[PDB]
Symmetry: D3
């Protein structure tokens, strides 16, 4: 009954939308859609919850990716089969540089490919680079709403734990290749870790699709505080504001 | 109030469970749990839906992993922090060998690592191999219900599309190293594709955890039919019966 | 005059044998054959000594592989051209885990591929995994004769010295990639080192042949004692008993 | 008497310059410098010819890199030791996409790393990405002079011949991994080949330096014409005007 | 009673020998030793048969390596522990270039590393190169007996079958990365295949030992004839005469 | 007007020359040519300065390569299109072994491939090995003029700074893969670092061209002195004498 294998959507469901905002968490989709006009629930299958809304009179889709490159790759492919050509990722993230503060915004120009799915689209030599128009719209949007913004490289990991050098785990073990890797990325000016951008950016850049990514900083691993839940939600809302404002300039 | 970062579970929720049945789809969790005694919904956050039930008087957890190694690695880690030591993967799958029929059951001895998350636990040379006791229990359980069973190697891909050499896609492109890859795996006796076992098996085998995997066949790509909804349901139930029977012998 | 390039055997020499027991040392072949009925010498060319015997009325071949993947790959290929479909490796080995004692038996489910010849059959991503029927027969055989058995992963090295992190050598040097590697394997639960199983298991698993491996523990590198020669021979004989008993269940 | 090993320059020679325009050809340096105020020849050693000039009252250096990552890496390092923090690459290039015409301008967002020197600064997974402020200034400058501009990915090769899949050569041979590579890059949206950007961008992005790249199109390999000398000169001047205008906004 | 783990030799057995002639086949050792003065059998264990003889009044050892890098690496290590510093490989080989005729002699300057054991001594980027003094002595010796000699690169494979692109095998399959590989080596001027030189040369070059290799051509795969037994014997003797003559100048 | 894309040369310019001496520095070419008869300037384009001269009545070309594999690869290809079949590299170099003294001569048998351009001609497994005739001529020439000569392996790096483990740099950073690499090469008997030989030797050895390399030692990194400029020039002249004398024996 669906037109795609996983999302549970038909072409008609999108009502001509060609831009998607793609958060990770299905439970966050509704909140984003409600910033815009006539928000409606389209489907919820597996980790993929999708809502439609209208932005300056144009249909947009908000669709969750789940955690990681593999589910992200399914969402992007199936949305592309449904007519989406522009993908904007919104998230919240840690930072790994001392000058980046909680509440700041990160716009990702390109990703360190510590994932597997990106390799299914392009060999490692190929850059996991964002579309310039999307990045520009995100930077301008952040400037417009008075954000403190950092623009640069993000490390994109297939794991939350060892790939980000976390040792407070069941085994306490980090495999050799990843032990000391965080210090390496820090030394090269990498801003932060997350888990989807290498796949998203590589997939889009090699498939004629436009992608960008913005995130709000909720923790800094170099001066690590327990996040205040109110502050997290405020930073999340701030990043969501930026991604929607950027989308307006990409329609 | 959660004891873990993603699953929204406490140690108390598990009531001493040390075995988890782990399907991919959150909506499949309830149906598996309800085959056992005193099933109770625990939590639903992101792609992770968890239920507790009782098997021969012992608590067991059913928890979804989402699609792909990255979310699987989070579920396994956090379940391990909550006391789970044995993980049984249940799924439905296609097959890529002519002798494997729809309705047959596949037990996976090891995976071809076409993923990224497995590398965050062990270098590529390390085998993505199942635990012998889990594999034995699954094979025995399949025999007990009179299944037609194939035991062998599964190719575990970070993508549904190019990594499984699908061409009916947005771009119709498959990157060089995956072009012709399906024929290679077929020639080497690989049974099927799926998207989580390389991570699950590598992780568990390198972290002192036990893992096995069973799947019901719903399609064969060498003799490809549209699956019948009734047949898929019966195959799902057949495979679920096998995984629960295996769990009985692993408590 | 021979039917194969290296083994010095004809098809008729095997008298219908479809199972081979494959030790490393040519000088050990006769001893194994003599456990069975009507043992006869077939050939001795290079490192390949072969004997025929009968097990429960069926011809079996015992053929040495020499040390390493390359000569093993020749033996397996040429035996396969002579009708052998099942290969059981028997050896004696060190262990690298504290809980494994001298005189214990190891059944290998899969190998860490620290060899070169396995790559000539399958890319690194492919698992060097044993056949489930062979592994089951070996586990059951070990259980039957009262062995203390460990089941799991073996590191399979192209060298005896640097690849197993031995420093009491001519140069005392271990190349960077291998320095500290033993600790890595130990941390991942690897049981032991040997030198042929990655090739044997990868070759067989990718070529439609069945293979398994059992070994007797003669030394433990974590609590390292000089082996008593009588104890070594007894452990060797015990492992040989197990491999022959397993073979009976694979005919 | 030089402050650096190769360039033959002193700190004093730069007169406080912190921005460099870096063409490949030493003979191109004078022409670029003479577009600005008070141009002066500084030094010529090996492939490194350097001139100083003034732009809006501020000192800027023009320095050639030679062909390839290795000489580029020397120039960037030694210029950084002399106070340069911003590097703008100017070149002329072919194109490999049908929609890109002779006389068009290419701004590079990131490079495919088909080089070796980039690996001496960051592992392959790290993106060879341009600085956002530099890329923005180049795009804005191109707009200011009314250029037809394409913004995207460039393939950066350590060779002119096999790495760009040229067959009209001494041997007519292209090694396996480069045979068919051009079609791969074309399918992934790559604009053009050149020979320095992977090193330049990776180096700068991992060392806290800012880099961008602009190039004028002189030939298109999908519709290959012999370039007219007059047209090439005009295109060179057009691109040089763009890089100088961008430099104005980066001082 | 042995001083080494595998060879069954004592320091005394060598009587001060510091040069070894190392054929692959244990049965070839006696014939080589008997060309020199006072030949004596030392030991035969596994694939390692050793004889001592005298050349211009000086002790030399002839010791077999078995097939492949792994057993070769054991022989070289243990001979080095027994005082051997110079290793001369003697073999017979096929050729893969049309200009190389049966009965010709090949002196190997370096090897293509299609093995695994070489990597246990040096990373892949390190050249599997022969010692200049050994190569010179072999070339001079070949000239002294009036050989037709080709000097160049040999491809050194961990397998006899797929790594040398043989298809007349059990499976008839050659894994992707070896399919078409022979044509690649031919185009690059590679003379021949064998199975030990990558390990021998890499090991020796990285461990302060001297190694060279000479081989007599018995077949040419571009103009493939069944070898005549008489011709092979003559070619063997011709090559053995060369290796002994070279040894004279390396004492 | 030129017959090649970069060198600015025609076939006639070479007057039948089939041997090239290839230094790095364009400003050094004239000095080398003037050792021979009738030296004349042919062209100076980019980093490629070429002079013709006559050696024992035969035309020879001296042509600079610039720094690095990429420009070297252009020079070699274009000279080959102009009829050059033999390439002799002359340089001055550091040494990394304690026994090598300033003023000594190094003849390179093969290179460690720490470059990128070599991979555009042959996969990493292929040896970056010099031609035996060229190496022999260089060794004999060094012996003839009373040089103190070391023959062996050179590490060939795409960078001057991090690839040779230099820390007195702008960032002071050396990427993980290269940190501690110098000690590794020293332990394997590598003589020295330079920047072009991996490309030159790999390219030539795989393309049917003959290449060799000789260098004068101007510094030893293990007992590091500031070079005396007079000593440097004398050592340079000594190495130039050797390369020209070798060329006489290769015509
Ligand atoms: Na997921
Ligand atoms: Na062997
Ligand atoms: Na250059």
């Amino acid at each position: 009954k669906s037109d795609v294998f996983h999302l549970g959507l038909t072409k008609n469901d999108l009502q001509g939308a060609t831009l998607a905002i793609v958060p990770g968490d299905p439970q966050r989709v509704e909140k984003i859609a409600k910033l815009m006009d006539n928000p409606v629930h389209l489907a919820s299958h597996r980790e993929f919850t999708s809502w439609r809304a209208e932005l300056d009179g144009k249909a947009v889709i908000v669709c969750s990716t789940g955690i990681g490159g593999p589910s992200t790759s399914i969402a992007v492919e199936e949305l592309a089969q449904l007519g989406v050509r522009t993908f904007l990722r919104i998230g919240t993230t840690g930072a790994i540089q001392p000058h980046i503060n909680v509440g700041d915004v990160l716009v990702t120009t390109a990703a360190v490919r510590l994932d597997g799915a990106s390799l299914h689209f392009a060999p490692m030599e190929f850059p996991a680079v964002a579309d310039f128009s999307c990045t520009t719209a995100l930077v301008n949007a952040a400037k417009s709403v008075g954000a403190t913004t950092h623009i640069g490289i993000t490390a994109s990991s297939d794991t939350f734990y060892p790939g980000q050098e976390r040792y407070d785990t069941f085994s306490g073990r980090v495999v050799r290749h990843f032990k000391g890797s965080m210090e390496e990325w820090q030394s090269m000016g990498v801003m932060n870790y997350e888990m989807e951008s290498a796949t998203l950016l590589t997939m889009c850049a090699s498939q004629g699709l436009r992608a960008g990514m913005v995130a709000g900083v909720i923790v800094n691993r170099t001066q690590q505080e327990i996040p205040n839940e109110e502050t997290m939600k405020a930073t999340e809302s701030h990043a969501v504001k930026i991604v929607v404002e950027a989308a307006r300039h990409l329609l």
